[PDB]
Symmetry: C2
Subunit: 160 residues, 2 copies
């Protein structure tokens, strides 16, 4: 009906877009450098501290892993219990929101002008160099093509 | 394997995130005030000119309608052929990316501090006022709850 259910106060602006897990958990980043996990009733499950503002929006893997980028140049992979799985350091701020492929590959852009393809274990698959910062979030076609925009005015289409 | 298929040149930075239609068409906005529809082979299907930069990420309805916001304060609804279905004016720039409810309701935030709920026909269902600009893109829970963040440091949960 448009009536407020609840509101959860974070330490800074919430520009990240919330993701909903399989168990109804809500994951969202905040300007206060934290990735929040909130129960459906409005109470905090846990919060993970990164080095910088978390403007990227979280993605949830098939195994429940939460993937999100941060202003500290890292792409974070966090287990549903709030413990860190691995973190991949890029060359610039990761404001792009990660996308997960059919084989589990994590795609995300970074301020370092690169689009990163990362294995689920945390190892680099490949990185494509664009002309400018990649703040757009990648999309994956049915054939596996990765589409993402870049600051160099181009929308890219890249093989798996 | 990370190889370039093609790159479509827009007139400005591409911070919007691409959306993929049922037929494979790729939709993305650009800083040049245009919303682009591109065939999977890299050729331009059509483009729609808005009043300001299209940083919002487009969403695709069940009937094929493409919804996207623009810097000109409008939320646009465009037919799959590139013609305007309707446009809804908010108080400020619409950088939030729209979400589509189970009943067809389109939810999106705006710079004017409001989260908008708009019927598929283009009329206002309701608008929820937050304490700051809503650049976060809303998510829709299993029970219809709409989750979105705001500039006022809060993550909002709002009933349908």
């Amino acid at each position: 009906n448009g009536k407020l259910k609840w509101k959860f106060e974070t330490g800074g602006s919430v520009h990240s877009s919330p993701a909903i897990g399989q168990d109804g958990t809500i994951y969202v980043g905040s300007n206060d450098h934290y990735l929040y996990a909130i129960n459906p009733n409005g109470k905090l499950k846990w919060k993970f501290e990164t080095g910088g503002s978390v403007h990227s929006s979280p993605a949830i893997g098939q195994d429940g892993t939460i993937y999100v980028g941060s202003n500290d140049h890292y792409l974070y992979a966090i287990n549903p219990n709030g413990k860190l799985k691995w973190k991949f350091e890029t060359g610039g701020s990761v404001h792009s929101s990660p996308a997960i492929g059919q084989d589990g590959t994590i795609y995300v852009g970074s301020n370092d002008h690169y689009l990163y393809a990362i294995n689920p274990n945390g190892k680099l698959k490949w990185k494509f160099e664009t002309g400018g910062s990649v703040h757009s979030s990648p999309a994956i076609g049915q054939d596996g093509t990765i589409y993402v925009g870049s600051n160099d005015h181009y929308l890219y289409a890249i093989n798996p």
